[PDB]
Amino acid sequence: MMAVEQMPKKDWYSILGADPSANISDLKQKYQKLILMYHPDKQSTDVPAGTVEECVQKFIEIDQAWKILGNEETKREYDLQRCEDDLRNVGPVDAQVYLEEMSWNEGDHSFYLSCRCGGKYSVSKDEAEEVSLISCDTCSLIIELLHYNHHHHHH
Numbered sequence: 001m002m003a004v005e006q007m008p009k010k011d012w013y014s015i016l017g018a019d020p021s022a023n024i025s026d027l028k029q030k031y032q033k034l035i036l037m038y039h040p041d042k043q044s045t046d047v048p049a050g051t052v053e054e055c056v057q058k059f060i061e062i063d064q065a066w067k068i069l070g071n072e073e074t075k076r077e078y079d080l081q082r083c084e085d086d087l088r089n090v091g092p093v094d095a096q097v098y099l100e101e102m103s104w105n106e107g108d109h110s111f112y113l114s115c116r117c118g119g120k121y122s123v124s125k126d127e128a129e130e131v132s133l134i135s136c137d138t139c140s141l142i143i144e145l146l147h148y149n150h151h152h153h154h155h
């Protein structure tokens, strides 16, 4: 039981200094301006190595807030967007898993699978009912969540 405010606290909103109440509009014009000023404008060619670490960092930085200027709810729809599209392209490469294998927990009513490399997955009884494509967070592979009915004896 805690307050349901969910305020910002990342380098994103700090990169553009845009309050959590701001909108994409105000952030639009403020972006080209803020970012512009954020770019390097000093006269110093004495940055060995770091010169790149800074350039490449500033690129991902300005872009970081550009989309997720705030919390995840800010603009995460775009993230998963390319994901769901990048996952389908892979299709069935690893293998298919049976719901009878995914250890079901009566505590939270959910199932979870463990890869044979190191990582593992965990989906909710409801989630797995809405989704199907499940990839591993370690090795380049993906499995399919198939729900097959076997046990049938009324509870």
Ligand SMILES: [Zn+2]
Pocket: 115, 116, 117, 118, 119, 136, 137, 138, 139, 141
């Ligand atoms: Zn794996």
